[PDB]
Design a protein around this nucleic acid. Structure first.
Ligand SMILES: [Mg+2]
Ligand SMILES: [Mg+2]
Ligand SMILES: [Mg+2]
Ligand SMILES: [Mg+2]
Ligand SMILES: [Mg+2]
Ligand SMILES: [Mg+2]
Ligand SMILES: [Mg+2]
Ligand SMILES: [Mg+2]
Ligand SMILES: [Mg+2]
Ligand SMILES: [Mg+2]
Ligand SMILES: [Mg+2]
Ligand SMILES: [Mg+2]
Ligand SMILES: [Mg+2]
Ligand SMILES: [Mg+2]
Ligand SMILES: [Mg+2]
Ligand SMILES: [Mg+2]
Ligand SMILES: [Mg+2]
Ligand SMILES: [Mg+2]
Ligand SMILES: [Mg+2]
Lengths: 87, 137, 125, 142, 92, 203, 34, 91
RNA sequence: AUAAUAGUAAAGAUGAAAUAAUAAUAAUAAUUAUAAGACUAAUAUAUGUGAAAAUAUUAAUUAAAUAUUAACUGACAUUGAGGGAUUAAAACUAGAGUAGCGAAACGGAUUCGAUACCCGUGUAGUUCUAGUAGUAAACUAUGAAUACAAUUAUUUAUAAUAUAUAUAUAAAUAAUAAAUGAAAAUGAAAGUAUUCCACCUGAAGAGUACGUUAGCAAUAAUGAAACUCAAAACAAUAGACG
């Protein structure tokens, strides 16, 4: 296969350490409720428990719950892992 | 000429070969004649490319000029070989005016020819003069 | 010079589709042989549907009959064969393409070479 | 005769405006075989409801937004429901990747296109591109 | 006519382009997503966007080169990080 | 000379290969030479290779490809599972015989194909195995059913008198949890080097 | 030449072009018949 | 009952390992995954759309050498053959 | 662009708007059906190929092209003033062509103003055929040739190996050692050497004027001086600033 060797870089590091955390539960519930209220008119009792669940979630604060360290291993091992020729 | 063949073949030799094959088969007519005709058509100059004809012309020139059978780099034979190509290249240019790359190539080729005749003149003047006279220069 | 051909002929008649194709093959083969040429093989291909609704002058076509003719000729002969093909109303697409004989003399059609058989000797056997 | 085979929902979604179009594929039941086959392949269409998001009272700039596009899609769906072109199957097609395209698909997914979806047999894009062709305008400086 | 009838829209399926999919009635949204993915793979929206204006041929060539470079750098980076991960896993 | 010593020596003895250490395809036999240390040598990170091996590795066994690479790391994987599969097979004690009517290859230019078994079993088929309880006719081995059954480091084809619903249908695709007993009938070995066992489910 | 240095040259060239444009009718008069 | 994606089916003749039952094995498997490669000039296949259509996207575009995974020369020959095909009616 | 079909009030544009061969003379969108030019999506890396300009839809013709062997020639070579040929885009002269784009011009916006940036009409031009002309950041800002010098990784081709292995060659591309260098950095050349040609000798004035030659012309080449300064320029450094 085609290998791709980089040039000498200043610092191997992920550009942005997106953590990729899970979406909020309260937001999901709110979206579900919105979807339900699309159908079934304005406020029918099919979404009677969903609204209650949303209220329970968003009682203390609007959202329920409130970093990736990959730099350390890349930073550490860049100089080793290089195919940089000798001094 | 009418029964000239491409691919380094000779019509007399081909017929003889075919006859020998026939004899071998017998040991081990109209249709055979038709096959022979088909073969000739395949190997004819007039169905083949111009490149084969040029190659043949170059070979002929070499045969004419070679100061012995082994030599192919004889300044005179080199010049003769150049000439055939030049003629063909000139003909091509005459068909195709604005083909400037191939005019350049022709130019280079005649410059090379001139250079080798100049050399021949220094080395062996009489031979050089004879070569010139043969080529029409 | 060995030239392969690919003509996609017209098929007007529903029940007897190959007739026009057959006539085309006859005529072009006749031309070739009158003109120092040697047709080697006439490979048929199926009544294959065209990718798009391809149109000739004042006509339209969606299905055609396909075939290869693998013939020898001069360059001028070939060029002229191509022209006649372009002219005629009973072919949709035509395509002559050279088969190089610098290395070999016996060369099968492109399809046969793709399958495995380089020379026509292999096909025969 | 005039038998409606299927309907085709066309949606051209440009930068500045949407164009939603409903049209019946009208096959006649009633010559050469090839010609008949060609006719069958490309059946004539008749336009039933044309729509553009200015028809829903969105003027000038607001018609280049999906909110207007979504509304137009909903209106189209309502017209389909009422005018009674829901008996046969439907074929969705699109053009030009606007905001309004995103709105239209969302409308179709949701309750606004609830009655239509069940008849929608195929979605099939047909955006136009060029293999060279006419040169485009010079890239605006701004 | 009989022959045409027998050919029950056989060509209609194969004649159409790859920008077309048969919808499952259980999930239209899924079908739409699949279509979108197909379009992305074919680069059709990006092509359309490129075609709105003219860009001088040398300038577009330069851009193309830059894009290629960027691509090659990214997969070189990926290769490097995979090695780094392996080293971490092992103990290095 | 030094050269002769090098040729003799234990790194030259390990036959070189650049096969993947991670091979997600079908594994019918060992790919790489397993290499063990002693505990003492592990304690000071020495495996008899070019370099020291990371202190993170606490297992005594490993597999490797390159003594040293351009990345300045030996290409290895700390695992020697293949020895345990062989040992399990030995414990099971089902002798591999060629189902095709052929002579045993161990008795009597180059052929790279596998000579009989690959050396997982040099056992001969004619023996019985006595115990306090008696002479063991049926070899009892615990294994797991997948859907085929995993029986002591080998996947094996399975047969039974009646398909038991109570055990199977209660947990349809969690059958791997419950270990069942098996009666291994015989072990054949195909050309590709796969051990084709055949078991029977006991209840 | 840096770009800054080039810009002086460019300016000079522009001025020259302008002068030529101005002195077209005059140049024409000078050229013909002498 | 459970889906197919979260359970590795060990083949019949294969060896396995305790690790092989795990989630991590399945993830590893997921991570790590022809006539033109066989060694025959693709310019024989210009009257064979069926085979050339394998090296083409659903719409009709030719696939990149990164995707198709060919020798550069062989890739360019394939591309040529495809272009010849579409110049003809067939393909 | 024209025409037909059915269909309904807006359409098109923009940062937001208008003007216009837009639209209640029935458009736009849609579906068909004709014509016309000009362009060439993916593959694509300009990889490669070409002396350089250049050069990627297909085919054919003619021309030229690589490597290794065998044989032959026997220094026939290198460079190259003058000279010669080719030389992007624009421009010009004829005769076709003219869809789209688009200098100019006119109109609408924008703005204090807006001879602009944005929008609309859109003529030269862009296209072909035959020429003229011989310039571009015509750049790798690096003239050509030969001998030589320390490594690695990539591909590409060649040979052997017992067709798929690990080897020997070359070739290119990417990192460097040494060396060179004002440094930036060059890296088989910007290194070590040899040969040949072109060119430079402060900045302004000036590639200007005058003169000459060439051109249908625009122009191209050739190319001074007076006057006036102790300036003028490059690499890199640290700031400030955006
Ligand atoms: Mg010479
Ligand atoms: Mg315009
Ligand atoms: Mg300078
Ligand atoms: Mg050069
Ligand atoms: Mg292209
Ligand atoms: Mg020279
Ligand atoms: Mg250009
Ligand atoms: Mg011009
Ligand atoms: Mg003109
Ligand atoms: Mg304008
Ligand atoms: Mg000229
Ligand atoms: Mg100039
Ligand atoms: Mg110049
Ligand atoms: Mg250039
Ligand atoms: Mg140094
Ligand atoms: Mg020096
Ligand atoms: Mg460098
Ligand atoms: Mg003077
Ligand atoms: Mg001048």
């Amino acid at each position: 296969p085609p290998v791709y060797r980089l040039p000498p870089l200043p610092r191997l590091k992920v550009k942005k350490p997106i953590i990729r955390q899970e979406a909020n539960k309260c937001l999901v519930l709110m979206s579900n409720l919105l979807q339900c209220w699309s159908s079934y008119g304005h406020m029918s009792p099919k979404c009677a428990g969903l609204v209650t669940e949303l209220k329970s979630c968003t009682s203390e604060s609007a959202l329920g719950k409130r970093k990736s360290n990959i730099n350390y291993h890349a930073a550490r091992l860049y100089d080793r892992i290089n195919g940089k020729p000798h001094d | 000429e009418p029964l000239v063949l491409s691919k380094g073949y000779n019509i007399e030799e081909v017929d003889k070969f075919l006859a020998a094959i026939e004899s071998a088969k017998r040991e081990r007519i109209e249709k055979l004649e038709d096959r022979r005709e088909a073969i000739l058509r395949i190997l004819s100059m007039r169905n083949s490319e111009n490149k084969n004809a040029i190659k043949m012309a170059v070979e002929l020139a070499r045969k004419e000029f070679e100061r012995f059978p082994g030599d192919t780099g004889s300044s005179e034979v080199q010049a003769a070989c150049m000439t055939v190509r030049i003629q063909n290249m000139a003909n091509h240019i005459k068909e195709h005016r604005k083909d400037f790359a191939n005019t350049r190539n022709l130019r280079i080729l005649v410059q090379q020819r001139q250079a080798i005749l100049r050399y021949l003149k220094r080395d062996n003047p009489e031979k050089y003069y004879w070569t010139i006279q043969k080529l029409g220069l | 010079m060995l030239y392969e051909l690919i003509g996609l002929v017209r098929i007007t008649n529903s029940n007897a589709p190959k007739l026009e194709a057959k006539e085309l093959s006859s005529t072009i083969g006749k031309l070739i042989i009158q003109n120092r040429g040697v047709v080697r093989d006439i490979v048929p291909m199926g009544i294959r549907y065209l990718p798009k609704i391809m149109k000739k002058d004042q006509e339209k076509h969606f299905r055609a009959y396909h075939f290869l003719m693998l013939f020898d000729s001069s360059a001028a002969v070939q060029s002229e064969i191509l022209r006649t093909l372009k002219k005629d109303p009973r072919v949709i697409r035509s395509s002559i393409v050279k088969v190089d004989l610098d290395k070999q003399l016996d060369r099968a059609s492109s399809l046969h070479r793709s399958l495995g058989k380089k020379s026509i000797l292999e096909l025969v056997n | 005769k005039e038998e409606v085979v299927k309907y085709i929902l066309h949606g051209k979604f440009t930068k500045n405006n949407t164009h939603l179009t409903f049209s019946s594929v009208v096959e006649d039941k009633n010559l050469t075989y090839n010609d008949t086959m060609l006719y069958y392949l490309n059946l004539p269409q008749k336009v039933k409801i044309s729509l553009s998001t200015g028809c829903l009272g969105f003027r000038k700039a607001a018609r280049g937004e999906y909110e207007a596009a979504f509304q137009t899609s909903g209106r189209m769906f309502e017209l389909i429901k009422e005018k009674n072109m829901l008996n046969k199957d439907i074929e969705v097609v699109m053009d030009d990747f606007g905001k309004g395209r995103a709105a239209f698909i969302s409308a179709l997914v949701g309750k606004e296109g609830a009655s239509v979806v069940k008849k929608v047999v195929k979605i099939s894009d047909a955006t136009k591109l060029k293999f060279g062709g006419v040169r485009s305008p010079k890239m605006r400086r701004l | 006519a009989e022959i045409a009838r027998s050919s029950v829209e056989n060509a209609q399926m194969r004649f159409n382009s790859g920008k077309s999919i048969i919808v499952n009635k259980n999930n239209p949204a899924e079908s739409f997503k699949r279509l979108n993915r197909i379009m992305f793979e074919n680069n059709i929206p990006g092509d359309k966007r490129s075609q709105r204006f003219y860009m001088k041929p040398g300038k577009v060539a330069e851009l193309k080169r830059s894009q290629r470079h960027r691509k090659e750098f990214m997969m070189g980076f990926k290769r490097l990080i995979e090695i780094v991960k392996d080293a971490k896993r092992k103990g290095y | 000379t030094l050269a002769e010593l090098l040729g003799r020596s234990r790194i030259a003895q390990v036959a070189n290969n650049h096969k993947p250490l991670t091979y997600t395809g079908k594994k019918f036999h060992p790919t790489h030479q397993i290499i063990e240390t002693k505990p003492s040598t592990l304690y000071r990170q020495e495996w008899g290779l070019k370099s020291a091996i990371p202190s993170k590795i606490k297992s005594r066994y490993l597999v490797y490809n390159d003594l040293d690479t351009l990345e300045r790391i030996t290409t290895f994987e700390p695992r020697g599972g293949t020895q345990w599969n062989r040992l399990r097979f030995q414990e099971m004690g089902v002798p591999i015989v060629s189902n095709i009517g052929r002579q045993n290859p161990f008795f009597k230019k180059f052929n790279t194909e596998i000579i009989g078994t690959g050396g997982l079993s040099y056992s001969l088929p004619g023996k019985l195995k006595n115990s306090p309880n008696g002479v063991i006719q049926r070899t009892v081995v615990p294994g797991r059913i997948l859907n085929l059954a995993a029986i002591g480091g080998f996947v094996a084809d399975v047969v039974f008198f009646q398909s038991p619903p109570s055990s199977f249908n209660s947990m349809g695709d969690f059958i791997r949890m419950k270990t069942f007993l098996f009666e291994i009938l015989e072990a054949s070995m195909e050309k590709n080097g796969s051990v084709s066992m055949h078991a029977r489910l006991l209840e | 030449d840096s770009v800054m240095r080039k810009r002086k040259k460019k300016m000079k060239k522009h001025k020259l072009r302008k002068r030529r444009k101005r002195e077209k009718a005059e140049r024409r008069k000078l050229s013909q018949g002498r | 009952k459970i889906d197919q994606s979260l359970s590795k089916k060990l083949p019949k003749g294969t060896i396995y390992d305790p690790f092989d039952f795990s989630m991590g094995r399945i993830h590893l498997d997921r991570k790590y995954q022809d006539i033109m490669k066989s060694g025959a000039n693709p310019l024989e296949f210009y009257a064979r759309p069926r085979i050339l259509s394998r090296y083409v996207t659903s719409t009709g575009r030719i696939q990149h050498r990164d995707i198709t995974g060919l020798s550069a020369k062989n890739q360019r020959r394939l591309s040529k053959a495809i272009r010849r095909c579409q110049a003809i009616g067939l393909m």
